[PDB]
């Protein structure tokens, strides 16, 4: 059997695509055969995303594995909910409920607020960015207004790259003017590195400060520079390297060559590529469960236009979504099981702290506890 899917990868996601290839070649079974059509594009441009989605719907794909940015969430979600085409996305979970979007990144607002309450913080700064939406910002603001905190929220997204040092220095001077010893960084692996370099330049990594890296990847960034600074920093970690599955994967991942698999010759692994591996596993398991129950999901090449009127959804889309949401497996990110809305439930986030000898796990946050 041939089950055609589609792949929407951003311009620059090399390690993610390498992990996708590793998962495709590793999880292949005999019940079917995935034939993904890859289409690298710019996810932040809604026009290119619409063009790629229509191009891949013109082939009659079954699902579409792809990323999206805050400027393209609505296009992807609306097209998927209207045309009845699933969408496995390792990006941030959309705000609210959205059918036919099988999100893969576990939530962080709960664990973030739990860590804030654990450290018993009352006044702190919160440097955020509008890349992954403004859900965490609103959650933090509401929790602070309910628990009477002093949050100093600052958008560091408009920092231009030509004179970033001056703006960062002025920002940290203004933060010191209010005596802000606690800072929560909510950025990706690049803005976090930039802010860390600026902190080191301005000399604030000395003992007496505390930072919280608000992202599922702690060891992804450059931590060998703040480790010996004196200040204690904490963060979250979805993919732990102490498990047996992650260890067996890394033992066969660091040995790969960077020429064939770009970004593979490394000991660590970004959590987005781990979610990509798990997404390949989840699609394979869903197709196996559909083929085991003898569900004839074979659709002819009558896909036709992409923006037809009226947009008629095929009768097998809801079946594929139901089979994809009812998949419970164990992967690199941990236990994978989705609720009715597609969001991830029953996960586990390993909270880490950067000691002088390295990051050490101090506990695990869940949703039931």
């Amino acid at each position: 059997n041939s089950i055609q899917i589609g792949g929407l990868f951003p311009r620059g996601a090399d390690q993610e695509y390498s992990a996708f290839r590793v998962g495709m070649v590793q999880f292949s079974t005999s019940e079917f055969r995935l034939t993904p059509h890859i289409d690298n594009l710019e996810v932040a441009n809604s026009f290119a995303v619409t063009n790629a989605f229509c191009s891949q719907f013109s082939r009659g794909v079954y699902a579409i594995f792809g990323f999206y940015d805050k400027k393209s969430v609505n296009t992807i979600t609306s097209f998927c909910g209207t045309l009845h085409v699933s969408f496995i996305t390792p990006s941030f979970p959309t705000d609210g409920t959205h059918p036919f979007v099988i999100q893969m990144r576990p939530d962080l607002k709960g664990a973030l607020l739990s860590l804030i309450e654990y450290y018993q913080w009352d006044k702190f700064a919160y440097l955020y960015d509008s890349d992954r939406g403004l859900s965490t910002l609103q959650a933090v603001l509401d929790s602070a207004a309910e628990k009477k905190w002093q949050v100093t929220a600052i958008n560091v997204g408009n920092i231009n790259n030509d004179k970033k040092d001056e703006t960062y220095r002025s920002l940290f001077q203004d933060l010191e003017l209010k005596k802000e010893r606690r800072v929560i960084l909510d950025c990706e692996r690049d803005k976090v590195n930039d802010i860390v370099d600026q902190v080191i330049t301005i000399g604030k990594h000395v003992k007496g400060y505390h930072y919280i890296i608000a992202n599922l990847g702690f060891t992804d960034g450059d931590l060998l520079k703040i480790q010996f600074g004196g200040a204690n920093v904490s963060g979250f970690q979805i993919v732990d390297y102490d498990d047996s599955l992650v260890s067996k994967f890394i033992e066969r991942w660091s040995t790969l060559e960077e020429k064939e698999y770009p970004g593979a010759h490394t000991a660590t692994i970004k959590y987005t590529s781990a979610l990509t591996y798990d997404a390949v596993q989840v699609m394979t398991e869903a197709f196996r469960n559909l083929r085991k129950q003898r569900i004839e999901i074979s659709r002819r090449g009558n896909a036709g236009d992409c923006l037809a009127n009226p947009a008629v959804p095929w009768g097998q889309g809801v079946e594929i979504e139901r089979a994809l949401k009812q998949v419970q497996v164990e992967g690199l990110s941990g236990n994978i099981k989705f609720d009715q809305n597609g969001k991830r439930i029953n996960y586990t986030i390993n909270i880490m702290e950067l000691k002088t000898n390295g990051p050490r796990k101090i506990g695990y946050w869940s949703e039931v506890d």
Partner: antibody
Amino acid sequence: QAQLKESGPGLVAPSQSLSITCTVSGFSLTNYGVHWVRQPPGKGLEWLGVIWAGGSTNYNSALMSRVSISKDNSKSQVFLKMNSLQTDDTVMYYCAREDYDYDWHFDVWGAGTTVTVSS
Amino acid sequence: EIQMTQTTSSLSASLGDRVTISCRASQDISNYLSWYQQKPDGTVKLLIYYTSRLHSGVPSRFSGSGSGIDYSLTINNLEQEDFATYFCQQGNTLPLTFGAGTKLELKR
């Protein structure tokens, strides 16, 4: 560098079984799958079967009653045991390792050993 | 089974020329074709994957094109090493069928 060295008997009695082996060096037989092809004299190769990395094997609808691939991940080997090898069934049997880079390609292909089942 | 059948059975052209071997499939292979090269000694190797892109480390002279059923691989400037058989496979469904291909020879 991943390489499959197809080592076979080279000759066998008529209507008798024929067992060849392939020892993939550099590629773990549990992570990447193997696929066997048969090229006749001066003709295009025909895929006989494949033993996926998960352990499940899928064979061609023609040689299904004859071909049977069995993998040993510990010894890192894949053996093809085709019984009732006829004189016309004597062709160059080769083994390759599939990959995935924007399409399902067979990257590393073994040199293959000639087999002429004749009494 | 998608029976990928090559167009020309055999071709002959001297060095310094550009040849183009074409193949056609039964059903739509969805541009998931691959052109490989088989030498006389038995050594096979990949030349063009996904019917559009050449493999890693292949000679830049050889290229591919053609979407749908028909797909053609064209050599830019022939040479002595380019004189070998060229086969085509369609990895869109099982059993993966390969084409007999044509062997380019040196015109004398």
